[PDB]
Design a protein around this nucleic acid. Structure first.
Lengths: 312, 4, 4, 18, 309, 306
RNA sequence: UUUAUCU
């Protein structure tokens, strides 16, 4: 047979940028030109800070989380003590101050102020205002690899069809208490930060029309999602985009007969591609030049930082 | 070579 | 923060 | 000044500046 | 300086910033960390145009493969209304690579990655009756979807593609170039992403919003007509800041001009695609090329005079 | 120069047969260092070919699935009528539940390290016949929109595969060789940098039920089967592998088939597997350039026994 | 020995 023939001095912006990620809101740290993104494009960064003083319904384990989604500080859900989220329970939005100004009133006009937003950091803080003998319970936190996916299914109709919509995945890791977490006496408060989900700092496009999730007309069973998401009034609040950030998960157990009152800080630095028309467009400067020192520092800090830390 |  |  | 020279001007300018 | 860069990463740079100057620029493709067979084809479109007098005609340079630009005419002193519709102007040979039906787009090739966007404008009027002005700014437009519920039996909420950063088009952007018609203008666009990624081809998209969909239901300010599915069509959305160009034509004006387009672009061939014969693997990464592309993109004016292309 | 051991173990599972390399490698040496979990997947199985029929096999970046096979009559290419069935790596059902809406519970996203496949013929000198040829199709997962006439009339969108077409005709360049000499092949990254692909809910068949194949544009159907047995989890950024296998009718073609791909997933905190996960290894410039260089270097495929 | 670059 015949064989065949086959023919130490990181740029100052990564100094101000790195400080955006793990520097408290009391340091009054500035957003900086942006990220030492390979990209040099035009962008306007903004540091979102929100202070919320609140009380916890006793005997109720209130579960809160930080949203990699722009415009909302966190989501609140509540349930019986010792219980976890359920298909019946729904989450309530709690947007950042001045939300309405950048996304407007209609779910469809979310897009005009800016095309896309890329996350910088996502931090949260808890401070207890409870006296010593009136307080009770514990705080517990773990992060979740929640990404925005899409589910496809066929619903009979004449003519019949297979409409498919967005569905969040990784919500199943939201019921059970994460293996790597921080748990402490409610009173000792707690502080935590979130890191980039991907190695690339790509710009996540802004979306429109999404108010609820599962979206209306869809069974929570046909979506696979463990529970529901209250978009809330479209004009008051909405979800525009999903950031490539690990979502944080905090729950506070309020034993029976205990009053727990504490303040809540939540901030995050972000970069958005300003609309030519937008007012905000005039503050924008260019994404600082790519610096290798700070880009590697940002990552070395992510793995070194503990899940959560004491309030003090 | 190709193995190491 | 600022360990290494 | 042509375009390949507003290009090659910032090339020997940024590559020399460092 | 210029002796530091790899040779493949240079034909790549000329194709990107100064495509007008070297009559021929095949290019060796992108010196991306990624090396795989791919075909680097540079698009050139020559078009002579006559402008309606008394009307600002708007033009759009978007990173859509096969189609160099979009245009619509609107009364002078005004900007595009929701009722205004845009029409495309394919690049020579569109039909050939993307078939005849919106169902045929993907057969010729699977994905793409934009290198450069280059536009030229050359005044072709007499100096005596020409009148008006050219204005330009770049709009950071990206492509995404919007889900809204619909009542059918049983009722469901269909989800479809929509465009963001759209309305930025109506108002004259803060960062812009403005000059008398006669001087014309040249300008280009750079990648709006940190890294260069491969965007997939999209099928069945003659127009946005698509049929059976009400505008505004999309939130988009105006409509985009690809037209006949056979004649023109929409393939994908590159990570390129789309360029916008307004031409004010005061009434009684005699303004015409030649237009040229340089889109250095890379695709990936399908074995059945006969084009695959000329595919050469993405040239190995060259660190300085990437520094220069980024560096100079950032150092360039939004636009420049025509005589200084 | 000198590189680290995690960036070397990664190079080894990706480019060293599964004979030499026993460990999947702590992870991929990239910027990312978040909690991930590596699992080298090996599917061992002996199969005989339908006689007189040409069988086509595809190795796609679909997690939990080794390949997709179907048979057509001799010398013919896949037609609209033909459909592919997948073969699951062991314990697939164990991490992607039983229903399509149950893929997201164990994990939330992923990306492929390498994708390798092999063939060791069993037939004896007097019984074996035919040829096996191979080419790689750059297949991506897109989406296609179109009008639909209902009341009210609307336009729904549905996922679809592009680059699907390259499979009908054999690649300009390929590995054409006698069935008796067998073959070894590998697939590499399809993107410049490694990106995580989200999981995919409710996808069992493509075109999805209620969808005409004509409107989808792709040449042939794909069925996962019962939600319980198999399913289509995701689509990785890797060129896909195509393989024709001629089986002359008066012949006996036996052979063993190994297919293993190392890969990384993002464990869900709830997940009973979250505990084995370790943080992604630090960036390694030496190993990345070497991974890319060996990719361009390796041939379409090599003869087996080599 | 032969046939696209850089000052």
């Amino acid at each position: 047979t015949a064989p065949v023939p086959q023919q130490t001095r990181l740029s100052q912006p990564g100094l101000a940028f790195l400080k955006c990620a793990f520097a408290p809101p009391d340091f009054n740290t500035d957003p900086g030109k942006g990220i030492p993104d390979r990209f040099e494009g035009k962008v306007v960064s903004r540091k979102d800070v929100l202070n919320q003083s609140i009380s916890f319904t006793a005997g109720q384990d209130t579960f809160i989380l930080i949203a990699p989604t722009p415009g909302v500080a966190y989501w609140s859900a509540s349930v019986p003590a010792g219980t976890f989220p359920t298909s019946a329970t729904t989450f309530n939005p709690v947007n950042y101050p001045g939300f309405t100004s950048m996304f407007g009133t209609t779910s469809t006009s979310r897009s005009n102020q800016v095309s896309s937003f890329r996350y910088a950091s996502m931090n949260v803080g808890i401070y207890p205002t409870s006296n010593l003998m009136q307080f009770a319970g514990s705080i517990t936190v773990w992060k979740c690899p929640v990404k925005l996916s899409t589910v496809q299914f066929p619903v009979a109709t004449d003519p019949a069809t297979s409409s498919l919509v967005h569905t969040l995945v990784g919500l199943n890791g939201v019921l059970a208490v994460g293996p790597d977490n921080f748990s402490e006496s409610f009173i000792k408060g707690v502080f935590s930060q979130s890191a980039c989900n991907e190695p690339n700092f790509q710009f996540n496009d802004i979306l429109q029309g999404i108010q609820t999730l599962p979206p209306a007309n869809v069974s929570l069973g046909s979506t696979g999602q463990p529970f529901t998401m209250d978009s809330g009034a479209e004009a008051t609040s909405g979800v525009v985009g999903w950031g490539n950030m690990d979502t944080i998960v905090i729950r506070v157990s309020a034993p029976e007969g205990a009053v727990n009152s504490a303040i809540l800080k939540a901030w995050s630095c972000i970069e958005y591609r300003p609309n030519p028309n937008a007012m905000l467009y005039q503050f924008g400067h260019d994404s600082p030049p790519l610096d290798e020192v700070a880009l590697q520092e940002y990552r070395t800090v992510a793995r070194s930082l503990p899940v959560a830390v004491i309030a003090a | 070579e190709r193995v190491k | 923060v600022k360990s290494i | 000044a042509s375009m390949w020279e507003r290009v090659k001007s910032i090339i020997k300018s940024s590559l020399a500046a460092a």
